[PDB]
Design an enzyme around this catalytic site. Sequence first.
Site, mmCIF file in Angstrom:
data_model
loop_
_atom_site.group_PDB
_atom_site.id
_atom_site.type_symbol
_atom_site.label_atom_id
_atom_site.label_comp_id
_atom_site.label_asym_id
_atom_site.label_seq_id
_atom_site.Cartn_x
_atom_site.Cartn_y
_atom_site.Cartn_z
ATOM 1 N N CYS A 130 0.808 -1.194 0.000
ATOM 2 C CA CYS A 130 0.000 0.000 0.000
ATOM 3 C C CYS A 130 0.837 1.237 0.000
ATOM 4 C CB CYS A 130 -1.017 0.029 1.203
ATOM 5 S SG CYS A 130 -1.871 1.635 1.268
ATOM 6 N N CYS A 133 -0.347 4.275 2.105
ATOM 7 C CA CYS A 133 -0.035 3.914 3.490
ATOM 8 C C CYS A 133 1.396 4.102 3.898
ATOM 9 C CB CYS A 133 -0.350 2.459 3.758
ATOM 10 S SG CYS A 133 -2.037 2.053 3.319
ATOM 11 N N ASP A 134 2.327 3.653 3.052
ATOM 12 C CA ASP A 134 3.708 3.441 3.477
ATOM 13 C C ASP A 134 4.698 4.349 2.813
ATOM 14 O OD1 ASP A 134 3.106 1.720 5.355
ATOM 15 O OD2 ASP A 134 3.177 -0.103 4.135
#
Lengths: 303, 303
Positions: A130, A133-134
Site C-alpha cells: 500500500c 499507506c507506506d
Amino acid sequence: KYDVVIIGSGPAGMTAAMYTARSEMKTLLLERGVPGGQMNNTAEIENYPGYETIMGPELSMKMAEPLEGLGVENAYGFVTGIEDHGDYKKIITEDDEFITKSIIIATGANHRKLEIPGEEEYGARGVSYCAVCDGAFFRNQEILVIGGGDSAVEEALYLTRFGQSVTIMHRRDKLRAQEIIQQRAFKEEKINFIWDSVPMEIKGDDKKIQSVVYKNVKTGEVTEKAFGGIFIYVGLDPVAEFVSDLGITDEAGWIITDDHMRTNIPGIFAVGDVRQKDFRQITTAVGDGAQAAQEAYKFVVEL
Amino acid sequence: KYDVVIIGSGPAGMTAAMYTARSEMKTLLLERGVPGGQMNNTAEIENYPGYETIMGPELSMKMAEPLEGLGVENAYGFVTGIEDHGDYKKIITEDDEFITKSIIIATGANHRKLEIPGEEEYGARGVSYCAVCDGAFFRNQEILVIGGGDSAVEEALYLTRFGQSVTIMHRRDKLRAQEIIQQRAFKEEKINFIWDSVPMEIKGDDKKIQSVVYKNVKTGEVTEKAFGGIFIYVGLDPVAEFVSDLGITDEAGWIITDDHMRTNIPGIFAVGDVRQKDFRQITTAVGDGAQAAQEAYKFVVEL
Ligand SMILES: Cc1cc2nc3c(=O)[nH]c(=O)nc-3n(C[C@H](O)[C@H](O)[C@H](O)COP(=O)(O)OP(=O)(O)OC[C@H]3O[C@@H](n4cnc5c(N)ncnc54)[C@H](O)[C@@H]3O)c2cc1C
Ligand SMILES: Cc1cc2nc3c(=O)[nH]c(=O)nc-3n(C[C@H](O)[C@H](O)[C@H](O)COP(=O)(O)OP(=O)(O)OC[C@H]3O[C@@H](n4cnc5c(N)ncnc54)[C@H](O)[C@@H]3O)c2cc1C
Ligand SMILES: NC(=O)c1ccc[n+]([C@@H]2O[C@H](COP(=O)([O-])OP(=O)(O)OC[C@H]3O[C@@H](n4cnc5c(N)ncnc54)[C@H](OP(=O)(O)O)[C@@H]3O)[C@@H](O)[C@H]2O)c1
Ligand SMILES: NC(=O)c1ccc[n+]([C@@H]2O[C@H](COP(=O)([O-])OP(=O)(O)OC[C@H]3O[C@@H](n4cnc5c(N)ncnc54)[C@H](OP(=O)(O)O)[C@@H]3O)[C@@H](O)[C@H]2O)c1
C-alpha cells in the site's frame, strides 16, 4: 429481522445501503474497518464521474456521509460465516449474530502475495502492498514496484513524490495498465522499468530489505539489484472466506452472480470486486451496488 | 477511422467517453444538445454516491468537465441513422457522416405522452414534462402532477416551491416511487393526492389550461377540477429511432444488450436508459458506460 444486511462498506456496500435505506428497508451495514474499502488506500482518483480528482479517503468520507441520516445502521463487525435457513439468514461475526431476510455481500478483494523468500520476513521494513499507506517511509530511497496493471503503474507514479527513483518490474514487455497511465509513467523521469522479469527473492539484513533477485522470463538471466522498498501489485484475490462452503464461488473463490447480482441462494446477492468479473472499478462497484439494492427490495417485498 | 463514437452525452455517454479516452482510443462524443441529458432536467440529486445533494445541472457540468482535457472530441450532432459495414460503421447526422470502428449508443429515454385531448393544444401554456424547466411559470397556481413513480413524486415535491398546492394523480392506490420520497410527499402539507384516477381531458380557453377531467379507475366516476398547470410523468420511451431497422431493439424499441453492453451487432454497444432494463438511475448509467468502454477497447484491440 433485518430486511437487508450489507457486509462491506466500500463503494459497492455504501451505494447498496444508501439505496435500501431510501427504499425504507431496515438496513444493517457491517464493516470490519474504516468505511471506504480500497478507496482508502488510493491516493488520487481521476475517473470517478462527477469529480475531476479527489483523494481516495475524501471520496470515502463523502460516500459514508449521508448514511446515518438515511437510517442505515452502521456497525463494526468482522463476518466469519453465513448460514442459509431458507426464509431467513444468519450472519456470524466474532462476537454477534444477526438475522436478516436478505444479504448483499460487498467485501471486495485483497492484494495477492508473491510467495517468495524475504516477502514475509520484510513485511514490516521494506515490503509494502500500500503506497499511500507506506510511501513516506521511503523518502529518498530506490523503490521497486512489482506488477504491470493499473495499480502497479499508478502507485509507482504516486511514489515518485517520495523515492529518489521508482522502478516498475513487469513479467512481460507491455503493461496492462490504462494507456493514459502507461504514457504518464513512460514520460516521468523518476520512473525506470525492468521488463520481462519476475522477482525471485527479497533480501536484506536483520532490520530491513536491501536487495531483490529477479529473473528475466525470456532468457533466465538472473540479476540482483539494491532497493530500499518493494511495493507489490500483482493482482487480487477475493475476500469471501465466510462463504467458502455455500457453493456460491468459483474455483478461485470469487462469488458468482447473474446480471442482477443474484447468487444461487435466493436473497443472497454479491456486488463489486468480490464478484467473479473482469473490470474492477469504483463506477461498476457503485452500479453493482445500486442493482443489488433494487433486487433485494424486490426479493423482500415478495417474501 | 474513429476507434469509438459515443452518441449521447448524458452520464452513461460521458462515463464511456472518459474511459475510452483514458484508454487512448480516438473518441468522438456526439450530443444533440447540452451535455448532461436528463440530469439537466433534474432539480436535486440526492442518491449519487459521492455527493450529499447536487443540482442536476451542476453534476452535468462536473461530469463534462474533464472530457476535453482527456482528448475526447466533443461535437454537436443529431444522429439520424447508423449503417453496419462489417469492419466499420457509418454514423449519419443531419449534416455529417462519421466512420468508426465501434459505437456506444447512450441516447437515453424521453417522456411518454398521455395522448389525451388538450395535451398538444396546451403544450405551450399549461402542459409541461419538465418541472425544473417550467416550474416558475406556475408560481401561486394549483398544479397537477400526473404519475406515481420517482419522477412524478420528486418533481411534485420540487414544485411546491412555486405552486399554492400540487396534486399528484395516480392510477392506483399505492405509489411506485421510492418509500423515502413517498413519505416526504405524504408529510408535505402542500401536496394533495387524487388516487385511483387517470386524466381524460385537459381543458382550457384560447390562451391556457383551466381544468382537467379525470376518471376513477375503480368506479368510473368522472370529475372535472380547476388547475393552472399539468406536469406529466407517466413513464419513458426509448430514444433509439436511428436504429429501428438494425434488429437490435425489442417490440417497445429499447436496445437489447447482454451483460457486457453488447447488441447483436459486434462493435455496437448500448448503455444507460436506452437499454432494455428495469432500473434507470445515474449509478447504473455510469456503470453501464464504464463497462461498454472497456468492452469497446477489447473489441477494437481485437479488430
Ligand atoms: C491502489 C488502488 C488504486 C485504485 N484506484 C482506482 C481508481 O482510481 N478508480 C477506480 O474506479 N477504481 C480504483 N481502484 C479499484 C477500486 O478501489 C475498487 O474497484 C473498489 O473500491 C471496489 O469496491 P467494493 O466495495 O467492491 O470493495 P472494497 O473497496 O474492496 O471494500 C470492501 C470492504 O469490505 C470490508 N470487509 C472485507 N471483509 C470483511 C468481513 N469479513 N467483515 C466485514 N467487512 C469486511 C473491507 O474492510 C472493505 O472496507 C483502485 C484499487 C487500488 C488497490
Ligand atoms: C425528473 C427526473 C429526475 C431524476 N432524478 C434522478 C436522481 O435523482 N437520481 C438518479 O440516479 N437518477 C435520476 N433520474 C434518472 C437519470 O437522470 C437517468 O437514469 C440518466 O440521466 C440516464 O443517463 P443516460 O446517459 O442513459 O441518458 P440521458 O441522461 O437521457 O442522456 C441521453 C443524451 O442523448 C442525447 N441524444 C438523444 N438522441 C440523440 C441523437 N439522436 N443524437 C445525439 N444525441 C442524442 C440527449 O440529448 C441526451 O443528452 C431522473 C430522471 C428524471 C426525468
Ligand atoms: N484507475 C483505475 O480505475 C484503477 C486503479 C487501480 C486498479 N484498478 C482495477 O483494479 C483491478 C486490479 O488491479 P491490479 O493492477 O492490482 O491487478 P491486475 O489488473 O491483475 O494486474 C496485475 C499485474 O501484475 C502482473 N503480475 C502478476 N504477477 C507478476 C509477477 N510475479 N511479477 C511481475 N508482474 C506480475 C500482471 O501481469 P499480466 O499483465 O502478465 O497478467 C499484471 O500486469 C483491475 O481491474 C484494475 O483495472 C483500477
Ligand atoms: N431518484 C431517482 O433515482 C430517480 C428519480 C426519477 C426517476 N428515476 C428513474 O427513472 C425511471 C422512470 O421514472 P418515472 O417516474 O418517470 O416512470 P415510471 O417509473 O414508469 O412510473 C410512471 C408512473 O406513472 C404511472 N402512470 C402511467 N400512466 C399513468 C396515467 N395515465 N395516469 C396516472 N398515472 C400513470 C405509472 O403507474 P403504475 O405504477 O401503475 O405503472 C407509474 O406509477 C425509473 O426507473 C425511475 O426509478 C429515478
